[PDB]
Structure formats: structure tokens, C-alpha cells
Amino acid sequence: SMSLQVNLLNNTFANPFMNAAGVMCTTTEELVAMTESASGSLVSKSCTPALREGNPTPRYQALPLGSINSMGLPNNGFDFYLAYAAEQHDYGKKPLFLSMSGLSMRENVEMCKRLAAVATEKGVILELNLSPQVAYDFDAMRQCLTAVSEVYPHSFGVKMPPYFDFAHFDAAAEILNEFPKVQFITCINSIGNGLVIDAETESVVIKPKQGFGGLGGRYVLPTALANINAFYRRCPGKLIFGCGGVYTGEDAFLHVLAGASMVQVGTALQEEGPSIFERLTSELLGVMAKKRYQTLDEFRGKVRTL
């Protein structure tokens, strides 16, 4: 008698699983397939105010241990994802997150002012993408969060890049803790600017930025658990969404042990498509069955230190 059920942000989620922002969530067909999937939720592609073409191809490469990408925010623009949230999305099936990646504070303000009414009306939840990248610039981070908090009369979350230093966990957590409207932290975005070299071609594998791109998949699992756990501990008044290196229910289990409420799936979803959510719910239930857990609350954040 087990349940993957999650209750947060005045919503019920059948399971903690959702796509990672920007994976299989750009087009109507992708958002519909995510909505029809076994996923507990979905998040729309990180949007700019206008349509963006993104970087030249190739800009994504599947790898044995995950993925490298420099997509360059290809998206249909805010209007498209706002309209999806306002008129098309079936909130009867599952809650919707809208990922926002304004290229300036002003763009985030303009989009948030217009998102306010649809959040109110329909219950779309903002994931503000902060992932120098804004979240690595504590002043730019504070300023963006101050602007969005000022103009957006709703709770939201922040998609954070990974940190690698306790001083940075502390500085990030201190800023996030100043903003009670930031009710979730998504840990993590890509491990930034890896470089994959193909030994056969003696070349990089993506065209933008000399082959440098965000790492996802198996590469990032320990970094993701560390950031999930770091912010779980440092932001006790906030929810942590896990993102990074989820291929299996066991990986999801580790996310939840580390403190994750929701568990986002990028690279694994990119490679397998939305049917992955049936497998992941099945596998996570299987993990909980072997371990005699009935709810996620029984082990969330209960990772044992030595």
C-alpha cells in the first residue's frame, strides 16, 4: 500500500516526476505528450519574451555518461507558453510549471507582470531560471529575485546552477532565504561548460562556443544530490526540486533521500521520451517496496551522515 503522492504549492502531484525545463517541453505536441505522460507534473521550455532560434547545430550530443548541450534557449517565446498555461493546459491531469529565462531583469519583470494574472486564474507555477550566469553573480541573483518578488504577487521557484563550495551554498541560501515567495529551489541545471572531445574525430561534438556545453546525465548525479542536500539543509523553509542524473527510480530515491520533493528528468527523458515516467514511477515504487516505505515523506531528506 504505497504512494508517490506529493502535496506542495497548494497542489497534489500523483508522483514527484516531471521533465527538466527545456527537455521535451518546447512545442504544443511536447507539452501535450508531457501532460498525457505518467509524470506528476511538467515544466515548459525556459522562455524569452520573443521566439528564439537558439544556437547553430549540432548543439546537443547524447554521451555514454549523459549529455552535453549549448541549446542557446530555442523557445517559442513567452506568449506561446503563457497561452498554453492560460487556455490549453489540462490542470485536471497535473499541475504546470512555466520556466522563465529572461536575458535581463527587465525581461523577467515584463514577463512576470503578465504571468501574474494567469498564475492567479489557472495556477501555473513560475520556475525562474537563474542558470557570468546570474546565480554565480550573487549581486545579479539578489537583484533579479528582488525585481521578480516586487512585481510577481505569487510564490515561485528558482532553477539553480550547481555550486561546488560551501561558501557559495551559504551565499546562495542566504539570498534565497531573504525571499519568502521563493518556495522551491530546483537543484540543478547542467554542470556548466564541460568540453566533450571525440577521440576518433579529434573534434568537439557541438558547434556553439568552441564545443563547451552544459553536462547532464550520469556526470551530474553526485553534484545534483550535493546541491539538493546543501539547499535542503540551508533553506529549511523551502522545497527542493531535484534535477540531475535521474535514469532510474533508485536515482529518484537518492534525490528524495537528499531532500527532493519533485524529481526532474532531462537527459534520460531526452533519450527515452515520455514513456520513461511509467518506468520511473514503477521503479521508485519497487525501490520503496524492497525498503518497506509507503510514502516519500518517510525518507525525504533522511540521508544518514556518518
Ligand X SMILES: N#Cc1cc(N)ccc1-n1cccc1
What residues from 118 to 147 belong to the interface with ligand FMN (CB under 6 A)? Answer: 129, 131
Q: H helices of 75-220, where?
A: 78-83, 105-122, 138-151, 166-177
Beta bridge partners, 157, equal 127, 184
Q: Is 1 known as a binding-site position?
A: no
Checking phi first, is residue 110 left (phi over 0); if not, alpha (psi -120 to 50) or beta? Answer: alpha
The answer to whether 132 contacts its own copies (rule: CB under 8 A) is: yes
Q: Is 73 known as a binding-site position?
A: yes
Of 17, 80, 163, 231, the residue at the interface with ligand X (CB under 6 A) is 163
Of 95, 157, 194, 245, the residue at the interface with ligand FMN (CB under 6 A) is 245
* Range 45-59 burial, b when 16+ CB lie within 10 A, else e: bbbbbeebebbeebb
DSSP classification of residue 52:
B
Span of 60-68, 106-114, 162-170, 262-270 interacting with ligand X by CB under 6 A: 162-170
What residues from 124 to 143 belong to the interface with ligand X (CB under 6 A)? Answer: 136
Q: Per the omega criterion (within 30 degrees of 0), is the bond before 188 cis?
A: yes
The answer to whether 253 contacts its own copies (rule: CB under 8 A) is: yes
Of 8, 73, 195, 285, the residue at the interface with its own copies (CB under 8 A) is 195
Instruction: Please state whether beta strands 6-8 and 42-47 pair in parallel, antiparallel, or not at all (unpaired).
Output: unpaired
136 class by beta-carbon count within 10 Å (0-12 exposed, 13-18 middle, 19+ buried): middle
How many of the chain's residues bind its own copies (CB under 8 A)?
56
How many whole angstroms separate alpha carbon 145 and alpha carbon 155?
A: 12
- Residue 209 CB neighbour total at 10 angstroms: 14
The answer to whether 93 contacts its own copies (rule: CB under 8 A) is: no
Binding site for ligand X (CB under 6 A): 136, 163-164, 168
Binding site for its own copies (CB under 8 A): 58, 65, 68, 132-133, 136, 161-169, 191-197, 199, 201-204, 206-207, 209-212, 215, 218-219, 222-223, 225-226, 229-230, 233, 250, 253-254, 257-258, 287, 291, 299, 302-306
Residue numbers in the known binding site are 21, 45-46, 69, 71-73, 129, 159, 188-190, 217, 243, 245, 266-267
